[PDB]
Design a binder for these strands. Structure first.
Lengths: 162, 43, 96, 121
RNA sequence: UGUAGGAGACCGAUAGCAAACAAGUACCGUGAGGGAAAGAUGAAAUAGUACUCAGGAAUGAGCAAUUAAAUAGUACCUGAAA
RNA sequence: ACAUCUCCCUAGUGCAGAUCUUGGUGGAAGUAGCAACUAUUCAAAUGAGAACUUUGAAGACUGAAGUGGAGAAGGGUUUCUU
RNA sequence: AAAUAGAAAAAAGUAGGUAAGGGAAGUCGGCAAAAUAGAUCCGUAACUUCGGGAAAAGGAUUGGCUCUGAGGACAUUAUGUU
RNA sequence: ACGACUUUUUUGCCUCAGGGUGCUGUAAACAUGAAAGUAAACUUUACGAUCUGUUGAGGCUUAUCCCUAGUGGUAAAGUGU
């Protein structure tokens, strides 16, 4: 959700020239004397975000398990990692239980419920068929600029402190 | 302005004297009142 | 009646507001918090505490203040809000 | 309202209105005053005071002027004036001529040079 | 025209002299000048709204009270339409 | 104070309208709006009632081409106390 | 104290800022905005009525600190006071 | 924008505090420290931008950060059917 927004934000129209008397973000010209009504297809001010959306065909890269002590660890990097970042996720902290690692972007905010559904028809594509082999999963901080990866590593790096 | 002559002085004191409301002892047996900013003397 | 000693983070309460209204808002937030906590109609804010809030001018109020809240019934219910001088804010507790 | 008292008080004190202090206690007694003789009495007692002034210190300037005397801030980035505006051309000329002419007269008059040598020099 | 009379098949308060009145006034224009709005309680106020209660005070109400009449209460006749 | 159809003279005699004249009044509407000039806060007093009265404490601004002193024009008791 | 206050903080407006890589290719128009700008030291063309052009163009430098050097006035015959 | 929406109201929640994660960049203070020189003794004592040490220090880090049933809190008692 972003609130009720202007035409540029909501619909992506080009701004009016620098010259414009009543502002650059002033609307698209509706036009038509006949028909004698606004054409609904015109872009216009109102809500941005909070829309229902189906993302389709997102690949599962990994299903994590709470039971696994090495859940976000890999065969390549064997140090103890669970999916929870260094200092936890911003606004979410510890991931409590089992988890889905899904390719790319997902609609809505963190903290939101998300519904996963099987595809309407089975998928025979290369990308569908393919077996993922992960090499590494980051657990660096996203609270900061993620300069470090684990609490042990931070202790080893600094050493002495007050 | 600050400077004035006898006729102006007398008239201004006259206008001041005049302005005062009607006496209530007469009334029990009307008014024209001037407010300085709203109505100027026009002399 | 009771007298209790608490810490108000004003930086948190003044977070959204502009330089010009920052110290006024901080005063209002103190009054509102004390009022809410002691749940009183009348809240009285001491001059020493006021001087402390306004000390660094409009831009930069104290980020944390230790306030003394006194619930007092003499209806004649009110609370008085006063500052108690303190150095470090580390380890402070919200008891009587 | 202390209006009346503050106008009289300023004349009694011989000082600005903004520097007059009325005691917040016994304010009724102060407010009851209605003559300059009364206001004088209040000041004499100590219920109306002229404030101590805000008056700036020369201290910061004295340090800076001492530093200027030490030659420290006379560098290029502390110049905005022309060399003439910094030190005037006429003044320098006038100094050299007057000191030299005083010197020449004193040598001639004391008879350490002659009139001829003096006039040429 | 000024003053004094007598008049009327005239007008009856947006009419009629600009003026039924504290009007050639208020007010406006640098000034020459321009120039209004503006009558009605009742028979009698030497009948003008007493007194009480509730009201900070305005005011309201009264089992209280003038008048034949107060939804006649002095910006008071009747009191149309919007 | 009112009528006259019994008859007849007389008329400034019949309004929806003139972007009519004059006066009142709506819908528009609790809306447009109350947008120059850095900032006020705390406690008290007054009083029936205080963001904008008064006092005190803070914070600030005008910044000597001043929201400072004096004066002219012009205004004319605006002064000042109660 | 300004003909108001409070609370919220999105559009939109208005006075502002700031922007990767490009650099007028947008638009009638580099309009807007920005770049430039003070001093000292250098250096300065076409052209000219020889007066100018000219701050041309084009460069460099500039803080803080601790010093070094130069510039007066008085009175002892080379020395002092300041 | 405001309605509206998401919530929670004692196995919680808020509040601070602690701890985590960070962000900044080495605080004040003191040194019988050094430092271009300065002045005053015959190598010491006054003065000195500065730099180094104590010192990855000191600060800030929830408001729309994370964890903690750690502190203290947790009211009105109103209204429609």
């Amino acid at each position: 959700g972003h609130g009720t927004k202007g035409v540029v934000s909501r619909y992506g129209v080009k701004r009016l020239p620098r010259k414009t008397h009543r502002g650059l973000r002033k609307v698209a010209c509706i036009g038509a004397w006949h028909p004698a009504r606004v054409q609904f297809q015109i872009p216009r001010h109102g809500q941005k975000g909070y829309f229902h959306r189906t993302e389709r065909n997102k690949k599962i890269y990994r299903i994590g398990l709470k039971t696994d002590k090495n859940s976000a660890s890999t065969d390549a990097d064997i140090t103890e990692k669970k999916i929870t970042p260094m200092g936890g996720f911003p606004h979410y902290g510890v991931v409590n239980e089992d988890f889905l690692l899904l390719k790319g972007c997902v609609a809505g905010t963190k903290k939101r419920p998300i519904t996963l559904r099987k595809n309407i028809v089975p998928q025979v594509s290369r990308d569908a068929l393919a077996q993922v082999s992960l090499k590494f999963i980051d657990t660096s901080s996203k609270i900061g600029h993620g300069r470090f990866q684990t609490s042990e590593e931070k202790v080893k790096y600094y050493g002495p402190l007050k | 302005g600050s400077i004035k002559r006898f006729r102006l002085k007398q008239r201004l004191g006259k206008c001041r004297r005049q302005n005062r409301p009607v006496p209530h002892w007469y009334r029990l047996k009307n008014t024209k009142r001037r407010h300085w900013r709203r109505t100027k003397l026009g002399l | 009646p009771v007298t209790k000693f608490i810490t108000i983070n004003l930086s948190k309460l003044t977070h959204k507001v502009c330089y010009k209204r920052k110290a006024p808002r901080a005063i209002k937030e103190i009054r509102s918090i004390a009022g809410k906590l002691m749940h009183t109609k009348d809240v009285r804010l001491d001059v020493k505490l006021n001087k402390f809030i306004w000390s660094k001018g409009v831009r930069n109020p104290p980020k944390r203040v230790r306030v003394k809240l006194e619930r007092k019934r003499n209806e004649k219910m009110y609370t008085i809000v006063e500052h108690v001088m303190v150095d470090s804010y580390k380890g402070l507790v919200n008891e009587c | 309202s202390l209006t009346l008292q503050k106008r009289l008080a300023a004349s009694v004190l011989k000082c600005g209105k903004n520097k007059i202090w009325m005691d917040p206690n016994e304010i009724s007694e102060i407010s009851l005053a209605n003559s300059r003789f009364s206001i004088r009495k209040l000041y004499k007692e100590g219920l109306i005071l002229k404030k101590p002034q805000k008056v700036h210190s020369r201290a910061r300037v004295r340090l800076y002027k001492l530093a200027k005397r030490k030659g420290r801030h006379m560098g290029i980035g502390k110049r905005k004036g022309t060399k003439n505006a910094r030190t005037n051309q006429k003044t320098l000329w006038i100094k050299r001529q007057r000191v030299l002419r005083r010197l020449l007269k004193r040598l001639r008059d004391s008879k350490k040079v002659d009139r001829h040598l003096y006039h040429s020099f």
